[PDB]
Amino acid sequence: AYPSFEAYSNYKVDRTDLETFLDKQKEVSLYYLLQNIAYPEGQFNNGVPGTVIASPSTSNPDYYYQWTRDSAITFLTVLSELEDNNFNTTLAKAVEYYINTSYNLQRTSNPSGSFDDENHKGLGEPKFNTDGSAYTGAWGRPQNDGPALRAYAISRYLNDVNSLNEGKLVLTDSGDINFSSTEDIYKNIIKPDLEYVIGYWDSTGFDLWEENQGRHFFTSLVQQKALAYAVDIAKSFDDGDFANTLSSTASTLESYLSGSDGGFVNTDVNHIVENPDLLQQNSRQGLDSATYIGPLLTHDIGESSSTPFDVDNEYVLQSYYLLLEDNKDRYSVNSAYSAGAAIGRYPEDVYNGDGSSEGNPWFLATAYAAQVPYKLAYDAKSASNDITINKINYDFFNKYIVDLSTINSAYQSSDSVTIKSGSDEFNTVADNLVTFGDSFLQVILDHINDDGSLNEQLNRYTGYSTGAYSLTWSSGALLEAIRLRNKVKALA
Ligand SMILES: C[C@H]1O[C@H](O[C@H]2[C@H](O)[C@@H](O)[C@@H](O[C@H]3[C@H](O)[C@@H](O)[C@H](O)O[C@@H]3CO)O[C@@H]2CO)[C@H](O)[C@@H](O)[C@@H]1N[C@H]1C=C(CO)[C@@H](O)[C@H](O)[C@H]1O
Ligand SMILES: C[C@H]1O[C@H](O[C@H]2[C@H](O)[C@@H](O)[C@@H](O[C@H]3[C@H](O)[C@@H](O)[C@H](O)O[C@@H]3CO)O[C@@H]2CO)[C@H](O)[C@@H](O)[C@@H]1N[C@H]1C=C(CO)[C@@H](O)[C@H](O)[C@H]1O
Ligand code: NA
Ligand code: NA
């Protein structure tokens, strides 16, 4: 049940009309995303401002909590909207309430620890109650992705304040508020998260799915991003030695991610092994949608981020392809899909959304799967960069994107194919990438609730939605897929 949920229902979903669907969901999913964020000017005006619920579901399952990860990812979408709107005050107030509530959560002692522990050990805590209190039940803690994603989101807000609002914050005359300046946000909210990442990146915690302990590609990747992105922020506040500490630590994490210490790049199977310790344990073979979700989050389309493992990385792209192939056989709901399909978390998954039996495809993983080919095309076209296709990825391209032999008949004799910007071959591949991306959004259209809200999961047999209702992260993932689709299609 989800008693606080309010439906929009401002249109009848037509499952035969993708273009119209995506036009309407650009607004409907934003409505549902914002509904789960507490702010005085919003629908959720009775919660502590800055609290993001993962879902209005309070039973079967009970997701009425604030997770550091979901809240940060939610705010990355809010920030994308804020940026597209040339800095909307309403949204900026929501971001600042979230920054303030994050300040309070950071200082809340919990089962992972406290703020005054070494490098703020308490910041590893995955979730809190909506009233701001510590969640004291058993849980897969700590999770070291949260502080990284939050540091990144709040850093990005500061860059936006400086670039789009002439350095001006919007809530600094409110009583509730634990900052008076951008420097206060950096020193007292961003920097503690960065100190946590510096202190704990190479320690044991749970993955983003809250289930396994050890090395995790997504976690290390979002940590590397937060550190790299904060370098210039630190420099801007005359925090130069710390800026260089961030730079060196980011470089160290980049080497970790790319080498045999991390264990993520696996040249036996030529794809990323998301959780290398589980490969060692023989419990999972390493395919995971987090492998491509992370790259998407750490290379936001405005930024031209140079951080490692963008979606063009051959190992990331092969994990994507192989998970797609797996899931097209595993889930009966996918049996008639010729192109994209409903994608889950990992092939070994047993979480059904409210217990254990068999795992399902997830709306968020499916929406992120659309973004992969959209971003390949966008990156190339927007920068006039070549598309380079490594031999590891020839099967993927030949199955879904292009007959490579029509590009270069001798492709099998080369380690790669490079397709020059502006060529007919390039336009063919870019266009075919977008068509392929669209097929994943069609899967969403096939199975979305009539009210336009997205659950956590869709049943692997029937495609009916299941698990947590109107999941904020589902809404965000779809919103970012639509934003990317529109941006790539708008390119001349
Ligand atoms: C919400 C979450 O749920 C499932 O995992 C939970 C359990 O439901 C929960 O009982 C608790 O499990 C412990 C258990 O009760 C106890 O017997 C034992 O000693 O140890 C357990 C903790 O290790 O904790 C876990 C979470 O650690 C799933 O397995 C999860 O995948 C699931 N995560 C979802 C939900 C959200 C919120 O939107 C996302 O942030 C997240 O990425 C997601 O995968
Ligand atoms: C309008 C409706 O559409 C969506 O439902 C889909 C499925 O997602 C989809 O997989 C497909 O279902 C078939 C399925 O593959 C298989 O199990 C079985 O063989 O038969 C199905 C084909 O007859 O087809 C339907 C579309 O007909 C959504 O998933 C739904 O949420 C949606 N609305 C339903 C659901 C509800 C409440 O859950 C009602 O409020 C409503 O009246 C109804 O239309
Ligand atoms: Na104040
Ligand atoms: Na890139």
Swiss-Prot record:
Substrate binds at residue 139. One of its GO terms (biological process) is polysaccharide catabolic process. Transmembrane segments: none annotated. Glycans are attached at residues 88, 100, 178. Its EC number is 3.2.1.3. SUPFAM superfamilies: Six-hairpin glycosidases. Disulfide bonds: none annotated. The active site is at residues 207, 210. It holds the Pfam family Glyco_hydro_15. One of its GO terms (cellular component) is fungal-type vacuole. It catalyses: Hydrolysis of terminal (1->4)-linked alpha-D-glucose residues successively from non-reducing ends of the chains with release of beta-D-glucose. Keywords: Carbohydrate metabolism, Glycoprotein, Glycosidase, Hydrolase, Polysaccharide degradation, Signal. Belongs to the glycosyl hydrolase 15 family. This is Glucoamylase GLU1. The lineage of its organism: Eukaryota, Fungi, Dikarya, Ascomycota, Saccharomycotina.
